[PDB]
Assembly symmetry: none
Homo-oligomer: 786 residues x 2
């Protein structure tokens, strides 16, 4: 069960911020040595806040810790792993370092509960850490290990590797880490396999170098013609480079035949002798090469060292890029060597590696930082890699499934690349733009709102009927709604030609239910289950089911039989919307105190009266005189009025046999402006809910009174999001569908709930994508140095 590389990250002098930037800094770039403060730019720069570290503790912190800390985050961004997801995993940390003025705090700061080791590199070298990393894994001592090293004599400062003027090494600062994982686990988690650690060996002189080298091969199973390249320890010292050359010559440079001579390189020629980082660096250099199918070159100076016996077989330097030939078995391979001054030697063999965003047309691409400064910087860093090789699903799935979700968040909804450059450019300056919502994460539960009539439209949620979770419940309604009413909800919703009309109350209302409880199930799917439900008129029967109070068989019987018994009030009644408080409301209908009821108080600015048609006409006439906005509603029945008393006897007889039962979830009854247990919500409740007033902003006030501050509305159109904001200023209201934008509004609202801190299961929203290259977090750098 091979060990798979699945991430890489690195930092080296001369401005090498990532594995990608090291390759373009090698092929044709890089001699990063010069004077004092090869040195890391901003090695004292650390983002203490980002990790939760005090300024007092961060200069009490070895810059080696700090720099590993950031670039281990980088590693995780690069493997597409949410660091937060790893808190409390069995995740090894294997690093190497030595005093100059450690895995324990990295594994702490990051909440990792795997083994943390810090191999002393004054003794060993970075390849020992990888050797141990790979041992944990195949032993089961963990399920994902970080492996690398960090570091905070030739007189020109340069390592002249395998060159006649090699006269001592130049010592460089640097970080270099990779992320590892048993292969069958890597693809089971759908990970980018960048390559395999085929074989590894360590021991403790030219004979020893040969033995560890044939030792490696023994564990990989390979021979030395099966490798094409060697990343050598090449430190540039007078007798050092002869020894290793001899021992590659004895080893790689024989038994090749049809396979041509091995190519020799030491990255230290380019970056310097990264002490505790140069080993894994050496690995990173190799890995970049295996995927490009190219031999990384070396920076050669002067001629070959004459102290070396190049004639003795096939091993010559790699000065310029070249194609990487596979081994006879078609696996491109390399070998990496590193030798501590202690006497520790190691050689390792790197072998090449073997919902329904449907329904809408935009895609939510998500960003998140810990400070608005960095969100704006993340926002610029993302014009960068938009357009060809990268679709938008692929890109967006990377940013939602791979990134940790931080405080200040941002969701750009796009359906083409060019539109999305503009949105990110906008957030680059805190400027608004279409599809571009910025926000700030706020934990806590979510309250699901179930409005009543007034939302509906012909063809609502027709797009969702192809979404397997939405259709599945629309099917379950169907079975009973045909049972009580001899029609299905899918008829009406597919708009079948012979389907009953949404103009009928006893049709539209059950159609609304099924849409409403299925949007609930749909949001469940996308990872969002409610912590409390607020119903509105008929809405409450949907609430009653989401909250467990009634079976869906019973909840159908109710909105059906009650809306069918409701037909008798059609053509005799009406309703009227008023923008005035409920106080001024009952002032204004006082002249027609009979005939006209107050049917619902929705918010300090919204009231619905219901009653007799002529009386409503004289009422609105008054309203316009007294200059208050009013609006006759498109109904011909006065719901929540003396009119309903007519059907009380029958309602109670049709609903007889229902089973109300204790609410699985807090339900705030709008009959009562108050949480009611649920076991009493039987026949008489559905009478008394229809006859009496909907105390909406009483329950929204009761819930808000209890800390709830996130509401999500299961409605084909947003009708009470305005109301909730008017009750609770500081609340946040989300709807689902929307006549005009049908399903596009929905994924947008999904994005927007996330942005405010709702926990969305993006892992099921998005299909499986190819990998894509996203920049790293822009750390805010405050310099700590003593």
């Amino acid at each position: 069960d091979p060990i798979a590389i699945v991430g890489m990250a690195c930092r080296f002098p001369g401005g090498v911020h990532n594995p990608g930037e090291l390759w373009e800094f090698i092929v044709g770039g890089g001699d990063a040595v010069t004077e004092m403060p090869a040195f890391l730019d901003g090695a004292a720069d650390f983002d203490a806040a980002f990790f939760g570290i005090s300024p007092r503790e961060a200069l009490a912190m070895d810059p080696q810790q700090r720099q590993v800390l950031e670039t281990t985050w980088e590693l995780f961004e690069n493997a597409g792993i949410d660091p937060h997801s790893l808190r409390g995993s069995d995740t090894g940390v294997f690093l190497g370092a030595a005093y100059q003025g450690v895995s324990g705090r990295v594994a702490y700061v990051l909440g990792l509960e795997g083994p943390a080791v810090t191999v002393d590199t004054a003794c060993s070298s970075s390849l020992v850490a990888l050797h141990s990393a790979c041992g944990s894994l195949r032993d089961g001592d963990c399920g994902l290990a970080v492996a690398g090293g960090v570091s905070v004599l030739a007189v020109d400062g340069r390592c002249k590797a395998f060159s006649a003027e090699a006269d001592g090494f130049g010592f460089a600062e640097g970080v270099a880490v990779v992320l590892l994982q048993r292969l069958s686990d890597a693809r089971r988690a759908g990970r980018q396999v960048l390559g395999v650690v085929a074989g590894s060996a360590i021991n403790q002189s030219g004979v020893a170098q040969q033995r560890v080298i044939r030792k490696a091969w023994a564990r990989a199973g390979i021979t030395g013609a099966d490798v094409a390249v060697v990343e050598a320890h090449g430190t540039g010292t007078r007798l050092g480079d002869p020894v290793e050359a001899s021992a590659l010559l004895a080893t790689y440079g024989k038994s090749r035949g049809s396979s041509g001579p091995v190519l020799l390189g030491s990255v230290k020629s380019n970056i310097g002798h990264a002490q505790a980082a140069a080993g894994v660096a050496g690995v990173i250099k190799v890995v970049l090469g295996l995927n490009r199918g190219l031999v990384p070159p070396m920076l050669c100076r002067g001629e070959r060292s004459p102290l070396i016996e190049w004639s003795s077989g096939g091993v010559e330097l790699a000065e310029a890029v070249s194609p990487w030939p596979p081994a006879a078995d078609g696996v491109r391979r390399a070998g990496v060597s590193a030798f501590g001054v202690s006497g520790t030697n190691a050689h390792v063999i790197i072998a090449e590696p073997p919902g329904v965003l449907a329904a809408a047309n935009s895609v939510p691409v998500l960003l998140s930082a810990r400070t608005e400064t960095a969100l704006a910087a993340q926002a610029r860093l993302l014009e960068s890699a938009v357009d060809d090789s990268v679709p938008l699903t692929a890109l967006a799935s990377a940013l939602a499934t791979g990134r940790a979700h931080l405080p200040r968040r941002a969701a750009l909804l796009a359906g083409d690349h060019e539109q999305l450059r503009g949105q990110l450019r906008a957030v680059a300056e805190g400027v608004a733009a279409p599809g571009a919502t910025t926000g700030t994460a706020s934990a806590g539960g979510v309250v699901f709102v179930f409005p009543g009539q007034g939302a509906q439209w012909e063809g609502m949620a027709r797009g969702l009927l192809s979404v397997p979770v939405f259709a599945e419940s629309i099917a379950e309604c169907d079975a009973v709604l045909s049972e009580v009413a001899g029609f299905s909800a899918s008829e009406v919703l597919e708009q079948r030609p012979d389907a009953p009309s949404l103009e009928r109350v006893d049709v539209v209302q059950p159609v609304l239910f099924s849409v409403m409880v299925s949007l609930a199930r749909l949001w469940g799917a996308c990872g969002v289950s409610p912590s409390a439900v607020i119903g509105h008129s008929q809405g409450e029967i949907a609430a009653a089911v989401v909250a467990g109070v009634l079976s869906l068989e019973d909840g159908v019987r109710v909105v059906a039989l009650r809306a069918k018994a409701l037909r008798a009030l059609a053509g005799k009644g009406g309703m009227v919307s008023l923008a005035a408080p409920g106080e001024r409301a009952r002032a204004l209908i006082a002249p027609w105190e009979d005939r006209i009821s107050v049917a619902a108080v929705n918010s300090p600015s919204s009231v619905v009266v219901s009653g007799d048609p002529e009386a409503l006409a004289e009422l609105v006439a008054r309203c316009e005189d007294e200059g208050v906005r009013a609006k006759t509603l498109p109904v011909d029945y006065a719901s929540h009025s003396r009119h309903v008393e007519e059907i009380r006897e029958t309602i109670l007889a049709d609903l007889d046999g229902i089973s109300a039962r204790r609410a699985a979830i807090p339900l705030y009854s709008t009959l009562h402006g108050e949480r009611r247990d649920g076991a009493d919500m039987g026949p008489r409740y559905w009478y008394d809910n229809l006859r009496s007033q909907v105390r909406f902003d009483e329950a929204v006030s009761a819930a808000v009174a209890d800390g709830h501050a996130t509401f999500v509305e299961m409605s084909p159109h947003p009708v009470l999001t305005a109301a909730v904001q008017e009750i609770a200023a500081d609340a946040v209201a989300i709807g689902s569908l929307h006549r005009d934008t049908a399903e596009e509004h929905l994924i947008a609202e999904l994005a927007r709930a996330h942005v405010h801190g709702v926990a969305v299961d993006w892992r099921n929203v998005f299909p499986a994508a190819p990998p894509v290259a996203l920049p790293n977090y822009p750390f805010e750098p405050q310099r700590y140095w003593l």
Copy 2:
């Protein structure tokens, strides 16, 4: 069916403002003749008249046009005659003890006499729908006006008549005209039957009497002051003898049946002997053992009241008849010797004497009045033939007025006006039933005479005093609030138990409450030793219900019936029956059985009052969203929450931290909370069978904060009232939304009167009883309801009283003169 005089009023010079004041004036022998007034803008210099004298009304110019709804521009256009009759026709109704307001749209006639120096205007201003006649240019007499009045009433052409006459010499042209004709006295005195009789002197005056068929005046319990036994008119002494003999002829008497004669007595040289001669020929003859007839002309005292003289003289004889004393003349010199005094028995009435009855026992008299027209008239005036409140120990004496000014004036008046002599039930009953209740009102509660003077003197300066409500009347009906828990005290309403209306409902309650609960509400209320204890929930509530229905039937009897009801928790059961929804028997069954059921929550919960809005208390109890319910919203600053006790103590601790006055109610059960769901299936089983019915009165439900037709208030309602919130200040503000502004509360101690005012700052809340001042409080509040425009049936409050002398409304004078 005889014609009864039921009221009198007059207004004569020399400060005679009422009847009794004239009778004081002549017995002291006043002579109301003065010099002639210059404030009327007369060319007195040129003036021409030889008599520089006369008898003029003090401030004839004055008038309270406000009080009658007449504009200051109309008032100056109003003949003073018409004003002075209006003010005095008001007084007449006051004296008669008749609410003028109640006579609008009545067939009440006006028969008046006057001449240029009017009955239909007085009729119009007062809303009188009877005959109106003005006996034209009173060249006959105010007695022709009376003669026609008595004729209508005989003819069934009306059922109350006003008769009399008014005189105000705006100009001196009747001093010029009779100065030519030579028939004026130079000193302005009418020296009647006197040797010095040298002509007459003219007089200003208003005089009126209120006439009613005796059968009716008695079936209206009026003060019969005297009777018009007969009258006659026609066209010389031989004339005067006919009109006299015919007056007796429809009176059914002879002249000895009469003891007194009020004569025309103008004091003219020619006139006196003619009438003396005719009276010698009539009442002088055929007396025997009856003694001579006694002769007066009131013009001796007040002058020739012209259009007003005819009934002036009738008032004088009515004064004497009821005092049983012959009024005196003012005599001057010795008898006219042009008068054959020798010819039989007529002597002058020189001073008071006992008034003798006729053979048949009836004092009588005769009044003459002869016009210059030649229209003569002679009338015969016969003397006339033949619960609650207990439970308190004060009595409400009311006052009312058109302006604040008047009400202070009315208070001064009334303080002297009637004390020590006469019971305050007699006085409070005459100020309550006998007057037009006006806008600016004031009730004064008192149980002794010297307190009533103190209160009375207090409102005379608009300062405060114990027992003394003032206010301002506000039209419209009344909502009956019915509170519940908290009210009760021990012995509550023991006083009213003997009040026969109140006692009858408690006996009604008793019947069924004993039938379903094994105890009488009376038991507990009589404080019997056997009685179950008011500490129990299943007793305190039925018993409170009974006190609540009864308080309401009592207010019914006192006149006051609810326009709309508002119960509170259990209070809604009382309102249910008061409003028609439930029979009294089902209402008891509901309050009995619910409170029995509520017993298994006793000792498991508690409730707690917070001085804070509902939205605050919702937030405050947030940490205990369970175990604690909001049980009541009573006002923008009063909530009651109920639930688990421990939960509440922690909440009480929370409120102490945030400076939010709270308080743990004397209750050990947590109603209108999750706690009740325990007994729901039992309530619904117990109450099954009761019978809701469309409310006969509008019921605002506290469950719903809104009016509910009431036919769906069967068992389920009585669970959901108990389990769910009490939305009081919702229901109140719904009724306030519907124009109500007066709430009176059928409770044993005022509890929600304070809420009600919080909800509506301008509303008015009345309570019934009060621990401390039990039945005393109810009368004080029944007055207080009246002060604010509530319509009380005072006639049934007060028992049957003797008449009383109440001062006249103090009209507030503007002068109007051209």
